[PDB]
Amino acid sequence: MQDAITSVINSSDVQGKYLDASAIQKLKAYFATGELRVRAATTISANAANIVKEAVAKSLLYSDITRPGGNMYTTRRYAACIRDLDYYLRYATYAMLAGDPSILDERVLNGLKETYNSLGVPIGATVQAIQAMKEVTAGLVGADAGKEMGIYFDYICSGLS
Amino acid sequence: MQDAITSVINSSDVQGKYLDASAIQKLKAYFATGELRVRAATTISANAANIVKEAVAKSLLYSDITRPGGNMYTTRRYAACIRDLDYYLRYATYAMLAGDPSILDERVLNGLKETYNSLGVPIGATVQAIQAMKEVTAGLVGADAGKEMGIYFDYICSGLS
Amino acid sequence: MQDAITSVINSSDVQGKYLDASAIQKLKAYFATGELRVRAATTISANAANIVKEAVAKSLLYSDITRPGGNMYTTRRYAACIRDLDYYLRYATYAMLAGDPSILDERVLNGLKETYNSLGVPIGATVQAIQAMKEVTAGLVGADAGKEMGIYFDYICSGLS
Amino acid sequence: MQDAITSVINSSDVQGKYLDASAIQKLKAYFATGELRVRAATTISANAANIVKEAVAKSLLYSDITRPGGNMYTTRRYAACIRDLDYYLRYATYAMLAGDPSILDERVLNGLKETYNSLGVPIGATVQAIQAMKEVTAGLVGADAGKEMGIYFDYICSGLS
Amino acid sequence: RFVPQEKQPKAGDPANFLAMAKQVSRPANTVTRVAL
Amino acid sequence: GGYISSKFSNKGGNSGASVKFSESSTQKVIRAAYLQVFGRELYSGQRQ
Amino acid sequence: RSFKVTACVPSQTRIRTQRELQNTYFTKLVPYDNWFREQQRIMKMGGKIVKVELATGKPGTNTGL
Amino acid sequence: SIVTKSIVNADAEARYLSPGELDRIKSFVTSGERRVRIAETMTGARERIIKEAGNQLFQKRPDVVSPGGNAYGEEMTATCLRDLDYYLRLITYGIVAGDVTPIEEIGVVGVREMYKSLGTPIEAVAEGVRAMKSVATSLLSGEDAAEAGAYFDYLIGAMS
Amino acid sequence: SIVTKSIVNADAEARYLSPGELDRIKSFVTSGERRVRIAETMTGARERIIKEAGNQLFQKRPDVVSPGGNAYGEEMTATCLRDLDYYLRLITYGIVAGDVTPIEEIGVVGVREMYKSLGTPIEAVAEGVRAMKSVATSLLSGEDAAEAGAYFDYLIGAMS
Amino acid sequence: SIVTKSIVNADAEARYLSPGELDRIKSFVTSGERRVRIAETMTGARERIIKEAGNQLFQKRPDVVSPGGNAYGEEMTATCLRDLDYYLRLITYGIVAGDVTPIEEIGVVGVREMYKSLGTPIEAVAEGVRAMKSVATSLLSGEDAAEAGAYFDYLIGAMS
Amino acid sequence: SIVTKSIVNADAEARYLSPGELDRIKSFVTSGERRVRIAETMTGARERIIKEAGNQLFQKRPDVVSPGGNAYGEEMTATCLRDLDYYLRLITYGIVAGDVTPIEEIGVVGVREMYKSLGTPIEAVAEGVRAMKSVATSLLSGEDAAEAGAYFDYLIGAMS
Amino acid sequence: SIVTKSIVNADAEARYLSPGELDRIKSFVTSGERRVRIAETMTGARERIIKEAGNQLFQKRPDVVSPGGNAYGEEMTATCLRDLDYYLRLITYGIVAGDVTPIEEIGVVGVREMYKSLGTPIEAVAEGVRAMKSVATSLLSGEDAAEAGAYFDYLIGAMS
Ligand SMILES: *[C@H](C)[C@H]1/C(=C/c2[nH]c(/C=C3N=C(/C=C4\NC(=O)C(CC)=C4C)C(C)=C\3CCC(=O)O)c(CCC(=O)O)c2C)NC(=O)[C@@H]1C
Ligand SMILES: CCC1=C(C)/C(=C/C2=NC(=C\c3[nH]c(/C=C4\NC(=O)[C@H](C)[C@H]4CC)c(C)c3CCC(=O)O)/C(CCC(=O)O)=C2C)NC1=O
Ligand SMILES: CCC1=C(C)/C(=C/C2=NC(=C\c3[nH]c(/C=C4\NC(=O)[C@H](C)[C@H]4CC)c(C)c3CCC(=O)O)/C(CCC(=O)O)=C2C)NC1=O
Ligand SMILES: CCC1=C(C)/C(=C/C2=NC(=C\c3[nH]c(/C=C4\NC(=O)[C@H](C)[C@H]4CC)c(C)c3CCC(=O)O)/C(CCC(=O)O)=C2C)NC1=O
Ligand SMILES: CCC1=C(C)/C(=C/C2=NC(=C\c3[nH]c(/C=C4\NC(=O)[C@H](C)[C@H]4CC)c(C)c3CCC(=O)O)/C(CCC(=O)O)=C2C)NC1=O
Ligand SMILES: CCC1=C(C)/C(=C/C2=NC(=C\c3[nH]c(/C=C4\NC(=O)[C@H](C)[C@H]4CC)c(C)c3CCC(=O)O)/C(CCC(=O)O)=C2C)NC1=O
Ligand SMILES: CCC1=C(C)/C(=C/C2=NC(=C\c3[nH]c(/C=C4\NC(=O)[C@H](C)[C@H]4CC)c(C)c3CCC(=O)O)/C(CCC(=O)O)=C2C)NC1=O
Ligand SMILES: CCC1=C(C)/C(=C/C2=NC(=C\c3[nH]c(/C=C4\NC(=O)[C@H](C)[C@H]4CC)c(C)c3CCC(=O)O)/C(CCC(=O)O)=C2C)NC1=O
Ligand SMILES: CCC1=C(C)/C(=C/C2=NC(=C\c3[nH]c(/C=C4\NC(=O)[C@H](C)[C@H]4CC)c(C)c3CCC(=O)O)/C(CCC(=O)O)=C2C)NC1=O
Ligand SMILES: CCC1=C(C)/C(=C/C2=NC(=C\c3[nH]c(/C=C4\NC(=O)[C@H](C)[C@H]4CC)c(C)c3CCC(=O)O)/C(CCC(=O)O)=C2C)NC1=O
């Protein structure tokens, strides 16, 4: 947990100095975009069963994966796969609300890269489902905030790949 | 591959009309600022190795990726990186005379986004380096041409991030 | 790349049997209609330019597809309209001589759903171009083999759409 | 392509520690049983065109799979699957000397799953062929090294099924 | 001039030449062998 | 069998494949590749 | 150390009467040491690089290639 | 353009721009206000150039306006001028760029397949775009009729 | 088929089919029934053409029947009949198509790497199938054994 | 020899010789006394090897003595025992040279097309080298049979 | 390693690894209990090898210690021992590997670039490395430095 | 001819001839006794053709012989009738080859670049050939109409 407020607190505290001008230009940029991020976090939570549906109905249904043989054939694999895609979207909105990907470094990308190769999960399909979930979310919230999730959606894809 | 004269041609062709008065106001605007773009092309290509040997010195030379555990100890990986940051200086100066960011798109930005995710290297250290390249190149060529080269550095920076 | 001659070789091989009497009359079923395909393939090859002008004249030449901003606007693209329409005519008469649509799936309908998407070619326009090409070659051949020619054109249009 | 010697070299430089005491008994475990491997790998090359004599003749030769209608019935599909079994023996013997299955997933297991589901190759026939060729090597190298060769044989069958 | 390189003496290894005459039967008849 | 990687969603390969025509059309590219780079037909113990 | 590209390139100046479907959809495997002289060849042709994949081993492994 | 040609030639040798080539771009940019007023000499008088070469084409070749020919009727004639209206737009792009590179990618690389498919004779177009040349250089100045006319004469020989 | 060889002969140069080549197809249709009469004479007289000509191969080459060789009397000479029966099946596939490629893609393309791994002399198969088609030409006629004669000799020149 | 693999596989990268490959040079000139004693003993009983391993080969594969085969009569079996003496001589070159390459160039790279043009079976000589290594490793010492028996093992393993 | 270089060479010939090279892996594994004493001796003197070879280098090239070279000052002579220690942290990765495959990919492949990119001449870097591998040869035995000193002196010709 | 490119298609694969195209050579040589009968009819009435194909051309495009045109003059038509007389020589070469490569190697390849240089319009010489096609097919019967008009088609579609 490091907010973009608290990130420049900690980078100023390791030097032990006060807030300079270029540190405040990170705050006053972040204080400017406050109302934009709050409008996005409402309309995702009102659509969080539909963003997780139109991502998988675009990219993963009727594919190799929903067919018998690989990784989403049984229902318990399907319930576990929609449990991940719900949890990626719920953890992406915190970095949209913070403005820092330190949530994704601490709470998501710790054990996830190791446990997918250890389970036989295709990384190359679930790096595509979050990639398919971006342009649903960039259309659902408006492209001004659609260019805000793209840092933190693909911070998962930079880590998970 | 296009330039700012033919992009005005292409933006008038795909719209349909001839060289209207909005385009000539755009095209004469290129010919005024085109004099300073040549005089800042030579002083970059003079000090092309001198920029990149100092832009690595602001951000990369004593960090996580010099103590063992990161991208560059393996001598091929550091020497690719100085060579990658060399090619950002070539293509931005190709973008400076051509007057458009689209030369950076069909030469740099389309391929490079998915390799750096796949090869596990950080994009966040790259965009920290090009922003460190922005603050030394404005000191060499002068500030008024630094606003010109600050455009195409940011198009790499926003494109990679 | 299976012919209707080779299709009854393909079925009799995997049975492990010789030239069966059921396979004899099936070959004679192709041999009976083989006179009506050689006499119709000469008419298509003598009218390939005399068909593809009249397929674009019914559905293509005056719309928002040959305006500036249209997909086949410039003559770099308009020559790649006719030639990419000529493959659908030249391979139509190829399966007419074979009596088997397996040639279309291996040579033609192979990546064309994916290729036209990543160029920007609208698939909803060229599906009508094939159907306009079907109604002009029905009068040039006759209702005997124009029934037989017409089952390949929607077969192209099935996997293309 | 890298062996167990380079792997403990790979896991020692990257954390900033020298060649410590705990890396030596990983190498001394290699240097103890490495004399066994040169006695093993020579005798496989004595029978490298004789294991494939027994490969068809135990589980494939006088079966219904070779009977016209099955998968292994063509001369272009016969001889393509003796070389496809001979490569699985030769790359096993590289791993027999590597102490590591990290020559298999670079050169053997890279595209081997999808090329058998697409080409109509039954997976169960190969693992009834590869695991049948584990025990004939157990009569040629002795008891212990065939159990070492059974690791990489099962690493094929874990990476094929 | 007539030698240079020849080990003429086959001598002992030969010979058998018992020989045999072989009959003809149908290929289809499962002589070929069908596992499973 | 066609281009197996990069899935290419519709392919009518006829994976049973008693007789394809495609095996001769890919055998004589391979023989012509040996016939240009080496310039001759290679010996049978040497062709990789 | 092979990659796995997939590349969409158009025909720039010529109108090829043969099919050349494969000449617009190179989805080949290129090794690492010669990808970057090869990547600029698609890039100067005006092609589009769609995806690249590590078909070979792990990134960050500094030995054994 | 000269900017586009000097980059792509210098990118292939992996070099920066030569000082002989940087002064080529420097004179090309500063003379860009000369070339844009040659472009507006034609687009200011475009509707006269079409109409005079409209009368000059059908005089020297009347079979295309004749019944049976491919421009017969008040809508089927309207198109052939509108096709000549495209080539005023193309050559005005060429004078501005200082090269025939927008003539290439827009206008001339597929005409030997298009009009053969469309049935119109290419040599019928090749004189109508040549009658465009005689009505243009009478309206221009002395020196730029070699400058703009090179983009005209490029469109003749690449047509026929 | 001779239809199938004709398209790929025209598709390599990206061409519609020549009317001289459709004469070969139109002659193939009116002579299509004659080749079915050729093929039934082989399948009807299969049990006299295999046991005889294999015995001609064993009289020409008595190396085959003797132990130490590839065959042996109880089933190995019997399974060299069914490995010889496959080629007569492939000729009848080839003559009704008017083409070489049903002989090719089933039983030519990898026979050298097969029979080296199987341990038979591939040349003895070629002398055996030469003994097979010596009596096959004397079976049916003298007229029909010439254009079916052109598909007999190819498999001789494919093994060696 | 040992240098001939190393002087080519480092010339192709245009570098000097890596000291791992200088172990390979060092690795033997200490074995060159041990590599020379074994080929002196192999040549010194080269008449007993061919007369014994040629003898019981025909008890294992009696087909090539039998009529219909190639080596019918003593005038061809003594011609057949030339290739046994040639391959015994090519063993003794490869032990002294130190590795795989001189027996590969002189007696291997045409033997699928030499022996096919002679009509002889390519598998039966591969049976004889396993008996040629049976009588040789039966007469030499125990410590060199892991060295000198393995140079036999290459010309087995690339013959069949 | 020497295991790794042999198997990639045998993949290029598409055969099994040769009995000439199988001596070397067998010679590597009986010297695998010979290589480990070189590795542990460099642990006990890595604070002694580097701290002497710096002053051996600075008496050979004192241009570095002068104000203006790339290591001037106490913060700048840190790396001119640390990059030397990093090369002592490369030989013990490849003493027990036997050869240069961890020497290249960590040390050699772009070393003409980055010392030019940092401004340090590699001829001074190779001099202290040569000054290092005189002291390490004197510290080890006469048999140890006979082969490891040949392995030491690869890097000087590889760097410059 | 068919035989001279069935060689080259079989030579570049280094194969012998397949029996599918040996049918194509054998059907060609028994068609040789009737194709030269077409060519003897064509050269027997060349002056009936060339005089009539001139007058069917010059009525259609009267601008080329009216002065201001390229073929103006008493003798300039006599070369331009001779320049159309050459295509009657080549079509009789193309009839007896059964092919179109003697049309191609002699009268196609640089025919755009000659008449661009000499100044005659390239479609105006193509309209003489279809005027020559209408009279030469009227010389013959029905079964020689398509066999002669196919090579007339190829010379039209190449020049236009
Ligand atoms: C979905 C389209 C892809 C996919 C999903 C899948 N995952 C599992 C199993 C697990 N997933 C997790 C995920 C997380 N742990 C975290 O802490 C976070 C951050 C919030 C995430 C996203 C874990 C821990 C497991 C294992 C434990 C469990 O019981 O779920 C499965 C089940 C695998 C199985 O064999 O049952 C599936 C199917 N897999 C695919 O095929 C798609 C590519
Ligand atoms: C062996 C266990 C198993 C189950 C349970 C299973 C369910 C399953 N049903 C699916 C779709 C579906 N299933 C249904 C079925 C129904 N809806 C209705 O209205 C019908 C009354 C009802 C039938 C009970 C429909 C309509 C879809 C398609 C949904 C869509 O495309 O939006 C899909 C997505 C496509 C795919 O990848 O397969 C899965 C995975 N698959 C399995 O392999
Ligand atoms: C294990 C593989 C490895 C290699 C090859 C390597 C090279 C290397 N040397 C460096 C610096 C350096 N290396 C030196 C060393 C020298 N310069 C001198 O003048 C001395 C004469 C000479 C030693 C012989 C110094 C002084 C620097 C820092 C340069 C500076 O700060 O300007 C740096 C940048 C700082 C860092 O992150 O370490 C790298 C990457 N580092 C590695 O980890
Ligand atoms: C002209 C358009 C273009 C770009 C921009 C480009 C990038 C590119 N960067 C690469 C490697 C690399 N690049 C880096 C980069 C860095 N190391 C760091 O610590 C920093 C974050 C960063 C630079 C200072 C590293 C560590 C590698 C090696 C990773 C690998 O082996 O894949 C490679 C693989 C080999 C090569 O260098 O040619 C390519 C192709 N290629 C292109 O064609
Ligand atoms: C070096 C690592 C490596 C392996 C292992 C490999 C296998 C491999 N097997 C293939 C085909 C094949 N594989 C088989 C396999 C078998 N047939 C049977 O009877 C059994 C089920 C199985 C016994 C092994 C068959 C029949 C084909 C050809 C498909 C066809 O007949 O069209 C192909 C497609 C190309 C071809 O051979 O035509 C590859 C690439 N390739 C590699 O690069
Ligand atoms: C044999 C199977 C097969 C076909 C048919 C095929 C077609 C194909 N059509 C293409 C382009 C094109 N195709 C069109 C198509 C059209 N224009 C329209 O407006 C209509 C919607 C449609 C035709 C009726 C256009 C405008 C282009 C140029 C745009 C591009 O570069 O993709 C290209 C790109 C290269 C080029 O021509 O420059 C290919 C390869 N490829 C194949 O492998
Ligand atoms: C900018 C590049 C460009 C070119 C070259 C171009 C040509 C072009 N000319 C067309 C038609 C035509 N073009 C003409 C023009 C002519 N025919 C004649 O007889 C005159 C001699 C001649 C003019 C010199 C006419 C009459 C038609 C309509 C023919 C028809 O509909 O059958 C069409 C089809 C309908 C349309 O205009 O959308 C195209 C695409 N379009 C382009 O975008
Ligand atoms: C149509 C394409 C095609 C061919 C050609 C084919 C051949 C073929 N020949 C075989 C065996 C055999 N073939 C022979 C043949 C011979 N030995 C001799 O002495 C004679 C010289 C010679 C033939 C005249 C023998 C002895 C076997 C059994 C080998 C064994 O069981 O070890 C086998 C293994 C057993 C079987 O399933 O019948 C196959 C698959 N399969 C095919 O799908
Ligand atoms: C330097 C590499 C090399 C070797 C080894 C070699 C052998 C060789 N074998 C020959 C013949 C032959 N060699 C054999 C030998 C055999 N056939 C069998 O069945 C057995 C498997 C084997 C002996 C046991 C036979 C039978 C002939 C005579 C072939 C014939 O008469 O058609 C001949 C021609 C006869 C002569 O010159 O005296 C040579 C030169 N030639 C070479 O260039
Ligand atoms: C067999 C291959 C072949 C070709 C193609 C060929 C063409 C040919 N046509 C020529 C002249 C000519 N050709 C024409 C032809 C015409 N004027 C028209 O208006 C009509 C369109 C057209 C013919 C119907 C004219 C007028 C000249 C004289 C050009 C001049 O003297 O300026 C000449 C120059 C005179 C000479 O060298 O004899 C050549 C070489 N000669 C050959 O041997």
Coordinates of N, CA and C in Angstrom, one line a residue, chain D residues 7 12 20 33 51 53 58 61 64 69 87 93 96-97 100 103 120 127 130 138-139 150 155:
Chain D
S7 N 23.0 -24.3 -14.4 CA 21.8 -23.9 -13.6 C 22.1 -23.5 -12.2
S12 N 23.4 -18.6 -8.8 CA 24.3 -18.2 -7.8 C 24.8 -16.8 -8.1
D20 N 29.4 -20.5 -3.3 CA 29.4 -20.8 -1.9 C 29.5 -22.3 -1.6
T33 N 27.6 -38.9 -10.1 CA 26.9 -39.8 -11.0 C 27.1 -39.4 -12.5
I51 N 16.6 -49.3 -30.9 CA 15.5 -49.0 -30.0 C 14.2 -48.8 -30.9
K53 N 13.9 -50.1 -33.7 CA 13.5 -51.5 -34.2 C 12.4 -52.0 -33.2
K58 N 7.1 -53.6 -30.5 CA 6.4 -53.9 -29.3 C 4.9 -53.5 -29.3
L61 N 3.5 -52.6 -34.3 CA 3.8 -53.2 -35.6 C 2.6 -54.0 -36.1
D64 N -4.0 -52.8 -35.0 CA -5.1 -52.3 -35.9 C -4.9 -50.9 -36.2
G69 N -6.9 -47.2 -42.3 CA -8.0 -46.5 -41.7 C -7.5 -45.7 -40.5
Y87 N 14.0 -38.6 -32.6 CA 14.4 -37.3 -31.9 C 14.0 -37.3 -30.5
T93 N 18.8 -38.3 -24.4 CA 20.2 -38.6 -24.0 C 21.0 -37.3 -23.8
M96 N 20.1 -36.8 -20.4 CA 20.7 -37.8 -19.6 C 22.1 -37.3 -19.2
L97 N 22.8 -36.6 -20.1 CA 24.1 -35.9 -19.8 C 23.9 -34.5 -19.2
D100 N 19.3 -32.3 -16.3 CA 18.4 -31.2 -16.4 C 17.5 -31.5 -17.6
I103 N 16.8 -29.0 -21.9 CA 17.0 -29.0 -23.3 C 15.6 -29.4 -24.0
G120 N -4.0 -34.7 -36.2 CA -4.7 -36.0 -36.0 C -3.8 -37.1 -35.4
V127 N 2.5 -42.0 -25.8 CA 2.9 -42.4 -24.4 C 2.8 -43.9 -24.1
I130 N 6.5 -44.3 -25.8 CA 7.6 -43.7 -25.2 C 7.9 -44.4 -23.8
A138 N 16.2 -49.9 -19.8 CA 16.5 -50.5 -18.5 C 17.3 -51.8 -18.6
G139 N 17.1 -52.5 -19.7 CA 18.0 -53.7 -19.9 C 19.3 -53.4 -20.6
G150 N 14.2 -42.6 -16.9 CA 12.7 -42.6 -16.7 C 12.2 -41.2 -16.2
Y155 N 9.1 -36.8 -18.2 CA 9.0 -35.4 -18.5 C 8.6 -35.1 -20.0

